[PDB]
Amino acid sequence: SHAVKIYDTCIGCTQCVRACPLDVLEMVPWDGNRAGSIASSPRTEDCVGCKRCETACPTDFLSIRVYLGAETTRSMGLAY
Amino acid sequence: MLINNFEVAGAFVAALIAGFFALMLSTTLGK
Amino acid sequence: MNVYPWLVYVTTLVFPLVSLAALFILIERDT
Amino acid sequence: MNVYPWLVYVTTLVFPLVSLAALFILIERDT
Amino acid sequence: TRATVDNNPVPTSIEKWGKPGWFERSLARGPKTTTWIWDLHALAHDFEVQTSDREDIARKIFAAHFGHLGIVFIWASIFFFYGALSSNYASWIDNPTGLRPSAQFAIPVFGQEVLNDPATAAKGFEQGGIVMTSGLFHLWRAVGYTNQTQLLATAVGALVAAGLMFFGGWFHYHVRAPKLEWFQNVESMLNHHLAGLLGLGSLAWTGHLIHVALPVNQMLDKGMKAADIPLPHEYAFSTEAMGNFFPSFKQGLLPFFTGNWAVYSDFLTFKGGLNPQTGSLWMTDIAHHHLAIAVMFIIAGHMYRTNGPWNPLGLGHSIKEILEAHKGPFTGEGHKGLYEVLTTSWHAQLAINLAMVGSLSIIVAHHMYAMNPYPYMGIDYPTQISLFTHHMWIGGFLIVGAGAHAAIFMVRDYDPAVNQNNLLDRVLRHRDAIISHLNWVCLFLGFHSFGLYVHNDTMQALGRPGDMFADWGIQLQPVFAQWIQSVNAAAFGPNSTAPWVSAATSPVWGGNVLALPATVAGEVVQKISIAPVPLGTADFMIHHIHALTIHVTILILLKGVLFARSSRLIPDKANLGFRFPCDGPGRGGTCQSSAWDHVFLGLFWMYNCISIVIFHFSWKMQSDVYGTLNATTKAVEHIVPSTDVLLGNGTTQAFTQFAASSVNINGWLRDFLWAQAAPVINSYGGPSAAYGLFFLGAHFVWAFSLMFLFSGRGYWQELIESIVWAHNKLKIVPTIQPRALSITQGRAVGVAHYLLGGIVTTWAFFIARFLAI
Amino acid sequence: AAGWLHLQPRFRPSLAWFKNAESRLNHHLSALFGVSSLAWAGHMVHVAIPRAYGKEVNWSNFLQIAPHDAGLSAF
Amino acid sequence: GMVSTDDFQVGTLLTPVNNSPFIKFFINNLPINRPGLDPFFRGLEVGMAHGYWLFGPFVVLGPLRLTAFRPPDIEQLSILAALISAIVVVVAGTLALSLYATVGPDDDTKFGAEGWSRFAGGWLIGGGGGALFAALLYLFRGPLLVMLLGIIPG
Amino acid sequence: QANSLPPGASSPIFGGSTGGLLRKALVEEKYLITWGSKEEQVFEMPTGGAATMVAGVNGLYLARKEQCHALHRQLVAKFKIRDSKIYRVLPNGEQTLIYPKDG
Ligand code: CLA
Ligand code: CLA
Ligand SMILES: CC1=C(/C=C/C(C)=C/C=C/C(C)=C/C=C/C=C(C)/C=C/C=C(C)/C=C/C2=C(C)CCCC2(C)C)C(C)(C)CCC1
Ligand SMILES: CC1=C(/C=C/C(C)=C\C=C\C(C)=C\C=C\C=C(C)/C=C/C=C(C)/C=C/C2=C(C)CCCC2(C)C)C(C)(C)CCC1
Ligand SMILES: CC(C)=CCC/C(C)=C\CC/C(C)=C\CC/C(C)=C/CC1=C(C)C(=O)c2ccccc2C1=O
Ligand code: SF4
Ligand code: SF4
């Protein structure tokens, strides 16, 4: 599966969970921003690698990085 | 003058249409 | 002459034995 | 003309298809 | 009905001219990067992302139509000015066969005057000139132009008509603009585009042919010169002048009102094919043509029901009841919804209309070489290659746009509530079967046409000419097409299926080689305008190439249409739009998954289709039709000679060059593409030297495309990072940010330059070959 | 194709259409026994009688050549 | 009416190409689907049909075919070459079927790997036999397509 | 038969398409979206075509989880339905909740 990393530059804008086609991400409580929440990925086995979360992250460099790795049925987007 | 093989081929195209319609009516009559 | 002898072999010899084997399958297999 | 034609038939035609079948066995059977 | 029109929506100002990008919200914030510049141009005619109100959208489309008809009248005026000031038309009317037609010269500056052909030099036009290939002069001779001042009057009238279309656009947008209820009464607009636009158009054209074009062409064919009468053989006061040309019935329009129609059988005939004297259609058959289809178009505009204050009028059909009457058990609920589709979506109408007009331009390309419409036109061979090639290319482009706006409908204007169990819905329910079966028949056509060509390359290379799919080897005879040639050739005489025809449909069906008088320096008659066009094994093969290329272009564009909204890969593709680059490198990679990309791929596959079509036409017309009658014993000598095919036993057999050499790719390379490109590469220092320059420049533009086609923008953006560093080191800082081109726009630049380079290379090759011989 | 069509439940007729039996007699004496007999009379006057006397009438020239030179004014 | 689906989640349509009862009788009693048959016999009958028709394109269309060659001296070479061609195409099909078998098949047949190897074996024997049978009847088409008794004397 | 709904859910009216389930649903995994609707109304299938759904609880088996989540965002963005639940259905009949995971 692909590798989803959340760094410490997150602002809690709620844009990487709204624009993700597969619900890989969710918000957990955190102390280091103003929204009080950081993104997390406990469902990386369903991620396809489509990088719509990387399109919608409003920082300088993206706080989310998905790394393209081992390919499964779910990650190659196969309905067969 | 007798008929040649292309006119037999046209008659067999016509008989293929007839055989398809025969097959359809015999199978629907089987229901 | 104007004959297709292979067609006589198909439709008078092969195809009736074919047809009797198909009707044997139709009248002897249960469901 | 000094030719071994059967050897051309072996290693240009038979042996490559042999080799792709063996490599197919190498890449498609688990353990 | 009732023409419900609002008054003054838009004030006429200059305030939006100083603000580019006002029409879209992201463009209105100002240029920050350079992609705004390309986003300024790509969204200029997308009125649906500018305003959300469909009524205002329809008014923008309507004023755009008037402005386009204005620009087409400007172009029409531009060639009418060039035919009216700097042409050889005063001397081309006396020698249509020995003088090359020209309406443009190159002025005495930089050495370009070697471009002036001295076979266009005659009286008035004593400079030489650029030989044209549009066939405007033969059109003009057929409709009755004998003089350059009336060409000037047409030019002034076309500028006045351009001004009228611009004032109509400004009036019907800015002052008094129609509403959405006016556009959706499609019944009345069909009734007044059949009976009024096409019906009265060809009825008034029949009026032009009868009063002007048949007598002037009879004077040009009976042997008198350009000193003609244009005003005293007309109207009531010289009614007997209609009797001096070809006997105007008994007296006047009195046998029109009394019903005896047989006394007009001298200028409305049904004779048949082409005239032997001029190589073209009989003008009386043309007039009786446009009258019979004029009549049947006024009958065609009497079909659909329109209700109003007209009392007994209002009988007919509503289109919705016809569509909702055709249901079927295979097709569910049939055409219900398609009236609401075609009365609320502009893109669906544009898809149908681009399909029909592109198909019709291809139909036009076939029938105008097939029946020559205009006098001495079929012997001017650059015009024949150029109009076939032109109308083929315009036809293929409009078919690709048809697939485009069908997919744009499927992205934008598809409503699932309207399209419940109709044909449009159930096509989307079995789109996998359609695209997969289409994929299979494209594979079948490609193997069983191109692998035949590859087989012929192989067996001719291996020294096995009898093993070839050819007329001397494994014969693939087009027996259905040859049988239809025999039927359309045989259907003219007594005891046939069209008993009162003198000279058949066309001579291409298998009857007679037709030739015309022309000079060519100091020679004899020669000049086959038209001949029977025989079909053999090579025609089987090239037509299955054509079926292949048509079917792959269908497969690409139709896979764009049916998978526009969703797929098994991307189920939310309609939310991503018509025009997006990808949905990321995931799911293996989703590059070129948008329906726009299928328009992008279908553009090159249209290039393939139409290029092999015009290549077939060039070699075919050249090898079996076009050429010379020999001065001894009237023998046919074609433009390329016959080939003595070496058989496997040792002897030869005579075939023509298409029949011998167009069965493999080596003969296409050598005898078509190496041999006939000799006059485009040897053209320097002479009148065709520009066509050599366009040939080389179009090779450049075609190769220049492949930088944009084979690369992508992340390379270019980090390269522009290094160039932007070089600019910021020397205090040269643009506020508009230098960006790499976007992915979709880089694909668009690449397809634009690929298309421009290939078609202009092929244009240069065709015109520079066909001017020579 | 008509038999296969009339087995489909849109085109299957009702029992009342079968047991109508006046209209069946009217149509068989009118069309099946009379129009076919009149059509065969038309075949004999258009084809068989002129071809017995050496003059050939086929499916390309039947609209032009009459059975009789006093044609249809005598009717 | 004609097109139903009978499990509308499954991406298929039940159509008179699909669901006409004689088409189901034909497809369901082709030898790969005909009930009560060991996989070897299914392969045998598939091979016999295939290997019988596979002789034809090689003999009519192959490198040894024409009327401008050396008598019917080359005709025996044509029949033998087409025979060997159809048997080696059947051998390639056998190789294909048994490479399918030996790597472990997952399919709607209830064949095993062993069952697909029985199919591969029956395919090979039936295919080469169908080639040999089509070659013998092609050798016999002279007397087969005429009344042979009548030209021969006595 | 093979695609049996959980009890309480009813099938939406659909004519059947070719974009739907393949062999993988039989042998590896399939997915099931189940939502609530207040009327009988018309939506677009993620596998092509148009369907309508009755009032009450509706369920649909799809080949991929992205197809179900695309159907979920279509229900949110077009008909304001936010009680869609997505199950991963194994071939032995085991269903596990994967959306919403937080409840
Ligand atoms: C009746 C004809 C017609 C009409 C009204 C439209 C209208 C439209 N099309 Mg369209 N289309 C058509 C035919 C038509 N098309 C054909 C024939 C094709 C096949 C080529 C296409 C393929 C197509 C695509 C792929 C797309 C459209 C899109 C659009 C929309 C916006 C386009 C725009 O903003 O302008 C902008 C125009 C430009 C930026 C010009 C581009 C550069 C041109 C092509 C180069 C010109 C070269 C020139 C011909 C020769 C060389 C000269 C040079 C050396 C100087 C608009 C609704 C776009 C859309 O988003 O739909 C909603 C889009 O995605 N069309
Ligand atoms: C010359 C280069 C080339 C070739 C050979 C192809 C070939 C093909 N294209 Mg492609 N294409 C090309 C350029 C080319 N394309 C370019 C530049 C683009 C960019 C715009 C595309 C974009 C494109 C799209 C978008 C599509 C295709 C499709 C296809 C397939 C069409 C089916 C067919 O023709 O039947 C048969 C195959 C051929 C004619 C190829 C040659 C086969 C030879 C003659 C047989 C060889 C014999 C044997 C196998 C060799 C064995 C030797 C052994 C040692 C291995 C075909 C395989 C379409 C498709 O997939 O439909 C089915 C499809 O949709 N093409
Ligand atoms: C579907 C169908 C169709 C088609 C069909 C076909 C396609 C055909 C065919 C055919 C064929 C294709 C046939 C075949 C055959 C065969 C055979 C009959 C064989 C054989 C053989 C043998 C007998 C062999 C033997 C052997 C062996 C095994 C071992 C050793 C050697 C030998 C030689 C002894 C149609 C539409 C028409 C109709 C309906 C149905
Ligand atoms: C340095 C410089 C320069 C130079 C440049 C160069 C070096 C170039 C080039 C270029 C090339 C190397 C090329 C090319 C080409 C072109 C082309 C290719 C074109 C075009 C176009 C057009 C306009 C088209 C037209 C047409 C059409 C429309 C279609 C049909 C055909 C024709 C042709 C008619 C210059 C002078 C600017 C100036 C200064 C600076
Ligand atoms: C009056 C007049 C004409 C003014 C001209 C206006 C003035 C002054 C400058 C305008 C700059 C110009 C003329 C071009 C810039 C285009 C550009 C940055 C290309 C780099 C690039 C290449 C080469 C690719 O292959 C490619 C492939 C796929 C995706 C992206 C790319 C890509 O980005
Ligand atoms: S990772 Fe990016 S998109 Fe997600 S919450 Fe943080 S800043 Fe927003
Ligand atoms: S390479 Fe370009 S088009 Fe392909 S997935 Fe990546 S960004 Fe998208």
Phi, psi of H94 (to 5 degrees): -90, 130
Instruction: Specify whether the CB–CB gap between E217 and E375 falls below 8 A.
Output: yes
Query: Which chains sit next to G, with 3 or more Cβ pairs under 8 A?
Result: B, C, D, E, H
Cβ distance G110 to G39 under 8 Å?
A: no
Q: Are A52 and E563 in contact (CB under 8 A)?
A: no
Going by C-beta distance under 8 Å and a sequence separation of 6 or more, which residues neighbour residue E244?
E233
CA atoms of E366 and E735, how far apart (whole Å) = 54
Helix, strand, coil % in chain A, rounded to nearest 5: 10, 20, 70
Q: For residue F60, which residues of chain E lie inside 8 Å, CB to CB?
A: 495-497
Q: What is the SS3 assignment for F10? A: coil
Find tokens 């049925």 and name the residue. Answer: A73
Secondary structure class of A29 (helix, strand, coil): strand
Residue owning tokens 């019903």: E259
Cα dihedral value E295, E300, E304, E310, nearest 10: -10
Our CA-based measurement puts residue E649 at a distance from the nearest CA of chain G, in whole angstroms, of 8
**What distance in Å separates the CA atoms of residue E721 and residue E728, rounded to the nearest whole number?**
10
Q: Which residues contact E684 (CB under 8 A, 6 or more apart)?
A: E692
Interface contact flag, C5 G146, Cβ < 8 Å: yes
Contact H76, H82 (CB under 8 A): yes
Residue to mutate among F5, F7, F60, F62, with most E CBs inside 10 A, is: F60
Buried (b) or exposed (e) across E474-487, using 16+ Cβ within 10 A?
A: bebebeeeeeebee
- Amino acid letter for position G120: A
What angle do helix axes E743-770 and E595-624 make, rounded to 10 degrees?
10
CA E173/CA E446 separation, integer angstroms: 51
Please, which residues have CB within 8 angstroms of residue E721's CB and are 6 or more apart in sequence? none
- E116: tokens are 């002036």
> What does the block give as tokens for E568?
């098994």
Q: Does B14 touch chain G (CB under 8 A)?
A: no
Contact list in B for residue G21 (CB cut-off 8 A) is 27, 30-31
**Cβ atoms of residues E116 and E128 within 8 Å:** yes
Helix (H, G, I), strand (E, B) or coil at E650: coil
Handedness of CA E252, E253, E258, E260 (dihedral sign): positive
Ligand at minimal distance from the CA of E739 is: 5
- Among chain B residues, CA nearest to C1: B2
Give chain H positions within 8 Å (CB) of G106: 27
Distance from C-alpha of E409 to C-alpha of E427, rounded to nearest angstrom: 15
Look up tokens 């109709």; give the residue: E422
* Full DSSP string of G25-55: HHHTTSTTT-TT--HHHHHHHHHHHHHHHHH
Helix (H/G/I), strand (E/B), else coil: E773: coil
Angle at which helices E537-562 and E595-624 pack, to 10 degrees? 170
Q: Which of E313, E499, E508, E332 is nearest to E427 (CA)?
A: E332
Sequence-ordered alpha helix ranges (H) in chain H: 23-27, 65-79
Nearest 10 degrees: Cα torsion B6, B8, B12, B15: 130
> Residue E631 contacts by C-beta under 8 Å, 6 or more apart in sequence?
E523, E524
Contact present, E551 and E455 (Cβ < 8 Å): no
Q: Do H18 and E571 touch (CB under 8 A)?
A: no
In ligand 6, the atom with minimum distance to the C-alpha of A62 is 2
**Residues 106-135 in G contacting H (C-alpha not used; CB under 8 Å):** 106
Pairing assessment for the beta strands A37-40 and H41-44 based on DSSP bridges = unpaired
Q: What share of chain C is helix, strand, coil (3-state, %, to 5)?
A: 75, 0, 25
Contact G12 H16 (CB under 8 A): yes
Give the tokens for residue E6: 């609002």
Of chain C, the end-to-end C-alpha distance in Å amounts to: 48
Q: How many CB atoms lie within 10 A of CB E110?
A: 7
- In H18-74, the DSSP E strands lie at 30-37, 41-44, 50-53, 56-62
CA–CA distance, G3 with G6 (Å, rounded to integer) = 10
Bridge partners, residue E102, by sequence: E131
Ligand 6, atom 7, residue with closest C-alpha: A10
Q: Which of E458, E452, E454 is nearest to E476 (CA)?
A: E452
For H58, phi and psi rounded to 5 degrees? Answer: -115, 145
Instruction: Report chain B's C-alpha Rg in angstroms.
Output: 14
Beta bridge partners of E514: E530
Inter-chain CB proximity F60 and E329 less than 8 Å = no
The continuous run of DSSP H or E covering E636 comes out as: strand E636-638
Instruction: Spell out which residues of chain G touch residue E467, defining contact as CB-CB under 8 Å.
Output: 63
Indicate the SS3 state at residue G4.
Answer: strand
Task: Copy the structure tokens of residue E324.
Answer: 């909702």
Give phi and psi for A37, each to the nearest 5. Answer: -150, 145
- Angle formed at CA E571 by CA E565 and CA E573, multiple of 5 degrees: 40
Q: Cis before residue H100, ω within 30 degrees of 0?
A: yes
> Chain E interface, mutation test: which of G14, G17, G18, G66, most E Cβ atoms within 10 Å?
G66
Q: What are the φ and ψ backbone dihedral angles of E530, each rounded to 5 degrees?
A: -155, 150
Strands E514-515 and E528-530, how do they pair?
antiparallel
**Contact predicate E210/E267, CB 8 Å:** yes
Chain F residue with Cα closest to B17: F1
> Which residue is it, tokens 């099909």?
G93
Bridge partners of E737, per DSSP, are E33
List CB contacts of D9: < 8 A, sequence separation 6 or more.
none
Element (H, E) at E298: helix E283-300
- Do residues E439 and E623 touch, judged by C-beta distance below 8 A? no
Q: Whose CA is nearest to atom 18 of ligand 1?
A: E401
Residue G112 carries which DSSP code?
-
Ligand nearest to the CA of E711: 5
Q: CB under 8 Å to A39, separation ≥6 — which residues?
A: A6, A10, A16, A17, A25, A26, A27, A28, A63, A64
Torsion angles phi and psi, residue H71, rounded to 5 = -65, -35
Phi, psi (rounded to 5 degrees) for E719? -65, -50
Query: What angle is formed at CA E56 by the lines to CA E52 and CA E57, rounded to 5 degrees?
Result: 65
Which technique?
A: cryo-EM
Q: Is G21 on the interface with B (CB under 8 A)?
A: yes
Angle made by CA atoms G88, G92, G96, in degrees to the nearest 5: 165
Question: Whole-angstrom Cα distance, residue A78 to residue A61?
Answer: 31
Instruction: State the count of interchain CB pairs (< 8 A) between B and C.
Output: 3
Positive or negative: CA dihedral E754, E756, E761, E763: positive
- Which residues are paired to E627 by β-bridges? E528, E638
| Contact call for residues E662 and E538 (beta carbons, < 8 A) | yes
CB E460 within 8 A of CB E453: no
The residue type of E409 is: F
Distance of CA E256 to the CA centre of its chain: 38
CA distance E759 to E765: 10
DSSP letter at A67 equals: E
Q: Are E535 and E482 in contact (CB under 8 A)?
A: yes
The closest residue, in CA terms, to atom 2 on ligand 6 is A57
d(CA F60, CA E115) in angstroms, rounded, equals 59
The resolution, in Å, is 2.4
**Residues 6 or more apart from F54 whose CB is under 8 A from it?**
none
The Cα-based distances of E766 to E389, E615, E664, E672 in angstroms read 9, 9, 21, 11
Classify burial at H72, counting beta carbons within 10 Å of its beta carbon; exposed 0-12, middle 13-18, buried 19 or more.
buried
Other beta carbons less than 10 A from residue H89's beta carbon: 18
Q: How far is CA E425 from the centre of its chain?
A: 32
Q: Identify the helix (H) or strand (E) that includes residue E71.
A: helix E54-85
Q: How far apart are CA E759 and CA E737, in angstroms?
A: 35
User: Cβ separation of C6 and G146 shorter than 8 Å?
Assistant: no
Upper half-sphere CA count for residue E350 (Cβ side, 13 Å): 18
A20: amino acid identity, one letter: C
Chain H residues touching residue E426 (CB < 8 angstroms)? 15, 49
At E192, the amino acid letter reads H
Q: CA torsion sign, E276 to E281 to E287 to E289? A: positive
Contacts of E238 (CB under 8 A, 6+ apart): E232
Buried b (16+ CB within 10 A) or exposed e, G70-94: eeeeebeebbebbbebbbebbeebb
Rounded Cα distance between A80 and E747, Å, is 31
**Contact indicator for E126, E760 with CB cutoff of 8 Å:** no
CA–CA distance from E577 to each of E403, E519, E586, G146 (Å)?
16, 61, 18, 70
**Between the CA of residue E17 and those of E8, E13, E23, G4, what are the distances in Å?**
20, 8, 11, 59
* Chain centre to alpha carbon of residue G37: 17
DSSP E193-243: IIIIIIIHHHHHHHHHIIIIIHHHHHHHHHT--S---SSTTSTTTTHHHHH
Contact predicate E768/E688, CB 8 Å: yes
Distance CA(D11)–CA(G24), nearest Å, equals: 47
- Crossing angle (nearest 10°) for helices E54-85 and E148-170: 160
